[PDB]
Design a protein around this ligand. Structure first.
Ligand code: CHL
Ligand code: CHL
Ligand code: CHL
Ligand code: CHL
Ligand code: CHL
Ligand code: CHL
Ligand code: CLA
Ligand code: CLA
Ligand SMILES: CC1=C[C@H](O)CC(C)(C)[C@H]1/C=C/C(C)=C/C=C/C(C)=C/C=C/C=C(C)/C=C/C=C(C)/C=C/C1=C(C)C[C@H](O)CC1(C)C
Ligand SMILES: CC1=C[C@H](O)CC(C)(C)[C@H]1/C=C/C(C)=C/C=C/C(C)=C/C=C/C=C(C)/C=C/C=C(C)/C=C/C1=C(C)C[C@H](O)CC1(C)C
Lengths: 238, 219, 221, 221
């Protein structure tokens, strides 16, 4: 029936069952084969439908599309966070002199003597005041996040989650229909992974107080002694 | 009572208009308390009923699994660590996790292997809850029967509904008790039957108001 | 699940036993669990002789699995009679006073193995040939379950519980044959009694098990 | 050339075998040389169960012969194992320092034979109940040659050479079954590995054959 090079997926022209496992009723689910009754409103026409509405918060379709909006915005913010949490630590272990490269203590860098050196360099950003930084942040973010919901200079009548015009798809990866529908579920799966990992960053910063790459090195050195259970005795109520 | 439009309600005599119109008395413990309207949609009502009964049975199992080492500490077996918010530290001890203080009965050493075996059994038995399996197949996901009732107390449907409302009332009381255990573990630091021993030692000082000050910031 | 007959029955692989259970094993016999993976009993005549052989093996194994445990079970109470294990029990014939039944000297206390061997040959040939053919208690009946004087207590009536007790008999008998093969190989490999093996396992299970004796039959040469 | 199916094929006595083959061995199955001189598979369902037994024995014996040859060849090439000889490779779990897989301590490092056997019982019961019934790797399939999860390389397509590959599988499986019996009996009577016996027979074939061990299991003692 099917030869060896088609089973490996050599030919990307005759792939029409690529969206069959992520959209439609014959897709992968949350508990796999141990999830029979898919919720009847999660029909799989949206990216990331693993049939998971166990708390039932998204039965109404208006609430469901608002939760889809919140999920994708939180997904992209946590993706930018989980890239922007480890990369100061990665560049400090590189040798670039970032003076406080852990993400949970990087906000206190602007209360130092020399302000906020960006890559550890006074030739860079060198921001001193937290007040003007938060002021230009709330002005710029008010303009951008207000342009987001009802359009603006980078698109007006486009989709509220996937505009993809000349500004938000400048490389043009989503010109094809099937490629856009596949990279939608790729985006939301990477975003759910990064949301889970940012929750892990929050809990790891709370109960350990060290760097996430420091946590990775202290798990690589001793996996069985330095697990999450050696810090399980840190919130015992006395 | 306990079913129909003339059943026991959450305000009692003052509960003829505050009860929502969509909380009609067919489901167990329908006391008419949806003051935030979260179970207005029927799918939200069904999913919240599933969450309520599963949280109920997990809470009563947790209540007995928390207080029975305390009652056995009253009885006389010492335990690795009777205190339920210090009970996980038995596997971190030198002798390991002895079950009833018996070193030749469990003697658990690896917490990582305990979590691995625990997740390997619990993921399977939690995924079997959704779509049948070796126990059942396609029953009511909240009241399966026919494999988990070896005595089978679900014969008469009136007594079945009576046992349903008894279960969900014991379950609301159990989640109430487990929430109490949670928020009186963190403010006292003593076991719950030990807090009962404090409150029975002197009832007017060993209250929650003896520890009502400790959570002020104070710079 | 309350049946041991019919098309749907308890089977030897549990829920893995739908692709098994071929057409000539229909559940019409006591103890049918669909275990014919070797395919030894396709012919119902061959199947009938195998069922007869299995059930007389079941009866003799239920006799044996208790007759091997009771000498060590009365050695538990402290009654000393020569030796308590079953696989070195015959040599008490060749003792200084002979094999005693319960140790008290006014009991059986026979000495010659050849005379009681000849008596066993004649009465067991007569009894087993009466079992196969027929004699003074029923001539032509079931070769499996004769009854009559074999049921003086009246359990052969009401045939549904007769079939239920047939399944109970073949299940306890298969457990007894499994136990007797285990007795044979615990005698071969360990060289001690099975109740002594149980005491050694209950005293120390983690290091004294079968894997402790796993390196015994290693051929050195 | 020579074929392996049909009315004339490769037979067990070779050219002196046209009268020798039975009637029921017409040659539609892989490995039909017509050797049923004891008549064990005259009934066709007994023949089917015996074909399944032969093929599963064949595959397990192929895996077993490769696993008896592999660590001995790696030891004679480069690798210090725990005990590369196959009939003493079990007791490495009792080597007080773990069972190193390729001799390296970074490998599986097993020290508890009861847990190893127990996870083997669980996984083997699961996979064999899948083999006889069905599961995640194919539900309704041939019980001996499932395919489409055990042929990811697609070698069962073009079924005229899939019949040849069936005959090749059963022939290497029968050679591996014969070689596993040789491994067993050579382990019993020589006490050294099959590759150690091969090096012995390659050194001096006149006295490192089997007849030097002919007086070993003598009936005198
Ligand atoms: C058939 C087996 C199978 C099992 C058991 C699971 C299990 C799960 N999947 Mg799924 N999957 C399975 C098949 C498949 N999944 C997926 C793809 C996915 C995705 C994309 C996702 C899941 C997710 C989930 C989770 C959804 C429920 C949940 O949130 O639990 C939560 C509860 C627990 C995990 C138990 C609690 C943990 C612990 C054991 C107990 C607590 C321990 C602490 C010590 C307690 C102390 C804390 C104190 C201080 C309060 C659940 C863990 C979701 C997920 O990852 O959510 C986290 C998710 O996004 N699965 C595919 C591909 C199609 C499958 C194919 O077969
Ligand atoms: C006739 C009088 C009557 C009234 C007024 C009520 C009303 C109530 N019933 Mg009730 N019932 C009454 C009779 C009856 N009930 C029931 C059957 C039930 C059931 C089954 C249930 C109730 C429950 C409740 C409670 C729901 C509202 C709530 O949660 O409190 C909200 C208000 C507060 C929580 C205020 C608390 C008081 C105090 C100010 C707290 C102190 C504050 C802290 C110091 C602040 C915290 C500090 C910081 C650190 C956070 C409430 C006490 C429910 C319940 O028990 O929920 C808890 C429930 O499940 N009723 C029956 C049987 C037919 C009755 C007979 O007449
Ligand atoms: C979901 C139910 C659940 C809850 C609410 C808790 C919560 C708790 N665990 Mg626990 N665990 C739970 C399940 C599990 N725990 C553990 C393994 C542990 C360990 C090793 C420890 C705790 C500890 C604690 C306590 C400290 C947290 C606190 O604030 O007081 C508290 C009772 C700590 C404790 O008992 O203090 C000494 C502790 O050391 N838990 C496992 C095994 C994987 C669980 C299985 O799901
Ligand atoms: C046969 C394997 C199997 C095992 C060992 C368990 C065991 C468990 N189930 Mg599960 N279940 C199993 C299969 C199934 N369960 C369920 C549906 C449920 C429900 C609704 C509940 C359980 C609950 C439980 C718990 C205790 C019940 C006694 C425990 C985790 C109870 C629980 O987790 O509450 C704490 C519970 O309420 N099971 C279904 C659907 C019919 C199954 C089908 O295979
Ligand atoms: C038929 C059942 C039967 C069985 C299983 C045995 C078993 C045994 N008798 Mg024995 N006997 C049996 C009937 C009789 N015996 C005797 C009289 C004696 C004497 C005087 C002695 C024995 C001894 C022994 C033991 C030899 C020690 C040995 O070599 O260990 C290796 C063998 C095993 C560990 C058991 C292995 C089981 C076996 C290989 C498989 C069982 C199937 C049999 C081949 C089939 C049985 C034979 C059939 C045809 C009737 C051996 C366990 C000797 C003894 O106990 O001292 C050491 C001894 O001195 N027997 C009489 C005459 C009354 C019998 C008549 O019923
Ligand atoms: C079923 C196939 C199987 C075979 C052929 C063997 C082979 C052997 N194991 Mg082994 N094992 C097997 C399964 C398993 N073993 C082990 C774990 C161990 C340990 C820990 C040890 C052994 C040892 C031995 C050797 C016993 C010494 C001896 O008496 O030599 C004389 C006998 C022979 C050379 C040939 C024996 C084969 C037999 C007479 C014919 C074949 C019949 C089948 C074995 C029966 C079919 C089995 C069924 C139930 C599937 C023997 C060569 C011991 C050892 O090697 O230490 C020195 C040892 O310590 N095995 C596990 C758990 C992981 C198994 C599970 O599958
Ligand atoms: C890896 C995660 C990921 C993936 C697969 C996608 C995939 C998609 N996005 Mg989404 N997006 C993401 C993350 C992701 N996005 C994040 C984190 C943001 C916020 C910055 C956005 C913001 C966003 C907007 C505003 C729009 C899209 C659009 C698209 C589509 C076309 C563009 C494309 O294919 O990008 C493919 C993505 C990759 C190949 C990942 C490359 C990662 C680079 C190499 C790292 C660079 C990091 C950089 C420094 C971060 C700062 C910027 C497609 C569905 C457009 C669309 O739907 O058009 C129709 C659209 O309008 N996305
Ligand atoms: C020698 C005793 C003996 C005999 C003749 C039979 C005969 C039979 N059994 Mg029974 N059975 C026995 C012992 C025996 N069994 C034991 C000990 C068990 C428990 C494990 C069972 C459990 C069992 C079940 C659950 C079922 C049967 C069934 C059957 C019938 C068809 C299967 C068949 O062809 O077996 C032919 C068997 C033989 C010719 C005996 C050969 C003995 C060899 C030498 C054993 C070799 C294996 C190995 C070396 C020793 C055991 C290893 C390990 C398990 C310890 C047939 C009447 C099925 C049936 O139709 O029900 C009536 C059925 O459902 N039997
Ligand atoms: C699905 C479902 C279903 C069922 O039925 C029900 C339920 C269960 C309810 C559900 C679930 C849900 C969930 C899971 C949720 C979660 C979420 C998350 C985790 C998020 C994250 C989230 C996360 C996030 C956002 C994050 C973000 C991040 C950011 C911004 C950034 C940050 C940063 C950085 C760069 C670094 C520096 O130094 C600073 C900072 C600034 C710090
Ligand atoms: C045909 C016919 C006909 C007529 O009619 C009759 C008659 C004659 C009867 C018949 C014949 C038959 C025969 C020949 C048989 C034989 C068989 C065999 C040998 C098998 C094996 C078989 C064999 C087998 C399976 C085997 C397998 C094996 C294995 C797994 C192994 C494993 C292992 C290894 C790796 C190594 C390590 O360290 C250990 C062990 C564990 C040891």
């Amino acid at each position: 029936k099917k030869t060896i090079r088609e089973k490996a997926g050599w030919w990307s022209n005759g792939g029409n069952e690529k969206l069959s496992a992520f959209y439609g009723p014959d897709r992968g689910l949350w508990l796999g084969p141990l999830s029979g009754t898919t919720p009847a409103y999660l029909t799989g026409e949206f990216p990331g439908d693993y049939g998971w509405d166990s708390a039932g918060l998204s039965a109404d379709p208006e609430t469901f599309k608002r939760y889809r909006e919140l999920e994708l915005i939180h997904a992209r913010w946590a993706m930018l966070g989980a890239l922007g949490c480890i990369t100061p630590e990665l560049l400090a272990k590189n040798g670039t002199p970032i003076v406080e490269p852990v993400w949970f203590k990087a906000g206190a860098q602007i209360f130092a003597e020399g302000g906020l050196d960006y890559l550890g360099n006074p030739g860079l950003v060198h921001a001193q005041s937290i007040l003007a930084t938060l002021a230009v942040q709330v002005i710029l973010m008010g303009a951008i996040e207000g342009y987001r919901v009802n359009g603006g200079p980078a698109g007006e009548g486009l989709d509220k989650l996937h505009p993809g015009g000349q500004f938000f798809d400048p490389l043009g990866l989503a010109e094809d229909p099937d490629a856009f529908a596949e990279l939608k579920v790729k985006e939301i799966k990477n975003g759910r992974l990064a949301m889970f990992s940012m929750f892990g960053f929050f809990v790891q910063a709370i109960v350990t107080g060290k760097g996430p790459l420091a946590n990775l090195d202290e798990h690589l050195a001793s996996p069985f002694t330095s697990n999450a259970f050696t810090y399980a005795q840190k919130f015992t109520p006395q | 009572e306990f079913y129909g439009p003339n059943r026991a309600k959450w305000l009692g005599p003052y509960s003829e208009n505050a009860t929502p119109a969509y909380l009609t008395g067919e489901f167990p413990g329908d006391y008419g308390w949806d003051t935030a309207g979260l179970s207005a949609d029927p799918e939200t009502f069904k999913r919240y009923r599933e969450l309520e009964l599963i949280h109920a049975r997990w809470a009563m199992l947790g209540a007995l699994g928390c207080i029975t080492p305390e009652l056995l500490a009253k009885s006389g077996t010492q335990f690795g660590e009777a205190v339920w918010f210090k009970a996980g530290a038995q596997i971190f001890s030198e002798g390991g996790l002895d079950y009833l203080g018996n070193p030749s009965l469990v003697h658990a050493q690896n917490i990582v292997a305990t979590l691995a075996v625990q997740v390997i059994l619990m993921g399977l038995v939690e995924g079997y809850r959704v779509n049948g399996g070796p126990a059942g197949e396609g029953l009511d996901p909240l009241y399966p029967g026919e494999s988990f009732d070896p005595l089978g107390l679900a014969d008469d449907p009136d007594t079945f509904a009576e046992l349903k409302v008894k279960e969900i009332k014991n379950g609301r009381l159990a989640m109430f008790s487990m929430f109490g255990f949670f928020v009186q573990a963190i403010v006292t630091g003593k076991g719950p039957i030990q807090n009962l021993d404090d409150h029975l030692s002197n009832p007017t000082v060993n209250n929650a108001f003896a520890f009502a000050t400790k959570f002020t910031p104070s710079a | 699940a309350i049946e041991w007959y019919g098309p749907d029955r308890p089977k030897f692989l549990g829920p893995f036993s739908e692709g098994d259970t071929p057409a000539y094993l229909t559940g019409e016999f006591p103890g049918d669990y669909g275990w014919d993976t070797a395919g030894l009993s396709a012919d119902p005549e061959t199947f009938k002789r195998y069922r007869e052989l299995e059930l007389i093996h079941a009866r003799w194994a239920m006799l044996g699995a208790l007759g091997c445990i009771t000498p060590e079970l009365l050695a538990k109470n402290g009654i000393p009679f020569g030796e308590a294990v079953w696989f070195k029990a015959g040599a008490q014939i060749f003792a200084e006073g002979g094999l005693n039944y319960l140790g008290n000297e006014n009991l059986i206390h026979a000495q010659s193995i050849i005379a009681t061997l000849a008596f066993q040959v004649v009465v067991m040939g007569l009894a087993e040939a009466y079992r196969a053919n027929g004699g003074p208690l029923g001539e032509g009946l079931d070769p499996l379950h004769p009854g009559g004087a074999f049921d003086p207590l009246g359990l052969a009536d009401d045939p549904d519980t007769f079939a239920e007790l047939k399944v109970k008999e073949i299940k306890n008998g298969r457990l007894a044959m499994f136990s007797m093969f285990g007795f044979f190989v615990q005698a071969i490999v360990t060289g001690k009694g099975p109740i002594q093996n149980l005491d050694d396992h209950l005293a120390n299970p983690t290091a004294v098990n079968a894997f402790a004796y796993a390196t015994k039959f290693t051929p050195s040469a």
